[PDB]
């Protein structure tokens, strides 16, 4: 219980990531590779 | 590093439920809370 703080950083950091990862992911499949 | 393979159990979940929770917020967003 050493890394209770420390990991929400990860929790953060990968959300806006995953986000904006996985939102522009779906246009570049929805057509956006022509 | 005893929660080596465990951690990985995390990052799968919270990627398949991330996806379709933020692809989803999109549209919910985009015009569809009438």
Do not use: K
């Not at 209770?4 to 590779?33: D, K, Q």
């Amino acid at each position: 219980m050493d890394s209770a703080p420390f990991e929400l950083f990860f929790m953060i950091n990968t959300s806006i990531l995953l986000i904006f990862i996985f939102i522009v992911l779906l246009i570049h499949f929805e057509g956006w590779r022509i």
